[PDB]
């Protein structure tokens, strides 16, 4: 507790590297405006037209929450590059979060003249859900986290949630939530804010790449002691002849050499080039994707199973929805031109990953003989098999950390698929409200409900503080590795700086593998 | 005491199950008016044209008053089904009252 | 070891719900006839015209066993409305199991 | 635990008389059949044709029950008459039961000779419903009680209950039980049972009639100071003039004298004659009758209000379902003759209460004045009202001793109307059941329940034993008592003796109100 005249918190942004530890801290001013006029608001997609797909059922709410879940959030570009040039991983560990700083203003128009004022004796309510007793919302990737350059101002994001819906309306097992009806501290102008979470025990995230692929992994010198069947009719000269012929593995042969693995899973994907006249002429991307079917519903699977975006020199094709997509700072809402997004591009883990928009390979469909011809199909989506392994998909310096796992019976390889750190108990909820003021009330009782507010709004700073486990390269690899570096020659602009208006950008996504490992 | 600048108190709406207890915490906020001009004042039902039964003497006062007796102040929904689904009986046992926050 | 004139075991039928814990107790009365004439027989699907699906081969045995495999053998009705109503989950934790009363 | 050879118990039928306390056993040798071959039956009065008021629904249970709630159950006849004679009140205290020396007995039956054998190795089980959970059937006067004489067998009844009725359906909220769902103990024949009870604190039963009326406590020979209106026209000579005159009360004024009590409540009922010539030429004893309405049901009420059975000298009258009337052993069940009941009298609290039959008083119904006369009404049911006083009914040796208070909200002198001591926690119910025995089943396996089952029945001997606390008689009146007397004149049996062919019979009901006692 301070008074009006006191801070009740400083500014800490920093990154401190230490040993196996780097601890990153960032500070943001934020401001929240009142949502929903104090309301809570049934929120439906009845009379909006939409496809049977597209229905929902659920709430707005007049709660704010922070998310920082992203990972400029936390590393600067700098930083990002310290990490992913010397680590073979990495995960989080513990956090800090501070709100401080707190200034409530309200806000009065007379004709067109709006004046802002201090209110002293407003509050704002926060609390944490620390249960996980509401929908927990972060995770789908939503806009609204803190700024990746630490002098930009965020407006906090209004919390809603959906419930089961059956078209446009609701179940009866349809839940409601109030979030009054949590305990939260309240928050007057020299009140602070302060929580501590502790992550779970996760794999470090792999940030490097193979320098093998699966079908690579023998001996190039030497023969196996193992033979397969090579030939089913004898070459002769004079005609072909039944005959059952047998090799031994040996190196001018490695694709027909008996192995110990498989690479992993695979749900094909339509391919797309970035070169508009390969394409087909037509909109295929909801009738050509890949989708699941869930209560009557589809979904495009997207980005889906964690799968090479393209093969050797095919550079210029992509997944159809199978890759993460971050927009520039000029691209528009809608329909925008490939040039105003930033297409990643996963192709590091071919080495153990099937390609994306190619099958995973051909079976057997019959049985043959004499009289029938051995018949093969293809393979476009293969689940788990016994010795299988694979890669999951890499995070980038502006996509999600964590994401929560669902909370069900059953699972396989809980690693979130747009990336990142699959928790059971995720960093929680952070949920934010401006307390409410009535207006004058009239002078004779009344029973109803007041509709009548002082307009205000809040802002202060807020801090997060993350550490991090570094897991360390062990290489003995005698030639130089890849690097993310900046292009030294000259150019207009420093990549991600500030322009001559003053406006951060970001040239371009960054993952995490650089480095090599054997396999 | 606290200042301008401090909260005296937090919000606090809870149902807490425990054993043979259960404890509801309900939180609101309120306004209050100025009422009758800061004066006492004589009621009745005179010059009401009023019946024989609805005669009435007495005074309306400045003063406003809290009100908590009903159960939906207390009970939510949800916590009102836990209540009667399970239990044959229940009584109140102890109460706590506060206000704070206040702005004049 | 009892004689012939005293009883071996009491009737127990009972539900008692403590805590996170539930403890189900059910009796039933049984009757065990002589299976097979005391043999072991070899059994098959020879020459009952089956289909290659159906085919078997095994034994039949001159015992009988004890199945209380079933969640009605344990909890009522009531007890499992109990359950599901109140319990995001549930699991078995130990078991006992008494057989009293011979008569042959 | 004992043997085949062994007795579990011994033969106890006592009655000892020390300080304040009377100690009464008794023991009885009971058979107990196989009821319902082993099942519970959903029972109803579907398809009887039952009138609307007469309709039920609820279950027949393989199980009997022991019931020794009535005064001949506990005290003989010669013992009830020490206990009248000489004491002002009663209560019971404690309780001890006990069943022993168990008989299992097999029955078989080949063309028509009926062979009985011991089968040593069966059960019976036995249960005491402690916390009273069962629907409870004591307390309604069903016969099957312990036989007055000690030397009789007696079949042990069966046990079956009622649950709410629509007609003759039941509702969602009717409940069922399964008595095996309880736990119980399972004797074989060397086996024996035992279980202790305790009284709660009730008032001692009113054994006394008062020797002073309500409306007689004024001293005969002293006017009052206070004045009552006796005139409201004078007499003078020629005309009756308006006029207000006041009286003191005087001994010679004792009805119109100011009194501080009233008369106990009143719901009266019709009077009918012991001599039929005098009654009414119709069947009125349901349209005539005092009953209660109970969703949208009719039940008599009977016995009713505790109210005298006829005024001075009025003896051949009796309140029509007013009083407790036992059969003796020559009647019938239905539509016996007059000679073979026996209708107590409850003359005795004339005192304090009101006669069943007549009207509890009158009441001004109107606004009197010059214009209109004073009207009155009859009040023929009276509630309780502050001032009243009153006695509850008496009981009997051949009457029910304890009933269970219903559990409800609310309650208004919780006396059961049958007589005796209302108990919040009665004498639990003890229920027995032979176990069923197994026929030999087939040769292969069926999953069909059962139907085939070795008939069988057991015996055995059942204890009771009762501790009572006794009042004693403090008066100072100087004249002889009226006492309960057996004549001293010859006749050709004894009372309360077994006849020339080992009936024992009991010659008339006996209250426990001889002793008198102050107003």
Redesign the interface.
Known sequence: ????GNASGNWHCDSTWLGDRVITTSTRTWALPTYNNHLYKQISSASTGASNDNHYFGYSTPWGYFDFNRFHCHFSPRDWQRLINNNWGFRPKRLNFKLFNIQVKEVTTNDGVTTIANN????V?VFSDSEYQLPYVLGSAHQGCLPPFPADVFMIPQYGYLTLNNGSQAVGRSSFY?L????????????NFTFSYTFEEVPFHSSYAHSQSLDRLMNPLIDQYLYYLNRTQNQSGSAQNKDLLFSRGSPAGMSVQPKNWLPGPCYRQQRVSKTKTDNNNSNFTWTGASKYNLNGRESIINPGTAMASHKDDEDKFFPMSGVMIFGKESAGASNTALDNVMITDEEEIKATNPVATERFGTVAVNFQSSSTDPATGDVHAMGALPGMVWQDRDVYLQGPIWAKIPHTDGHFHPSPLMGGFGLKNPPPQILIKN????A????EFSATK?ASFITQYSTGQVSVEIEWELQKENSKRWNPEVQYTSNYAKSANVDFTVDNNGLYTEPRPIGTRYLTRPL
Chains 1, 4 share one sequence.
């Open positions: 507790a301070d008074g009006v002293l004796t407003s509050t309510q109030c009054e009806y949590f305990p939260s501290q309240m928050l007057r102008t020299g009140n307390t409410p003021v009535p004058n009330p009239p002078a007041f």
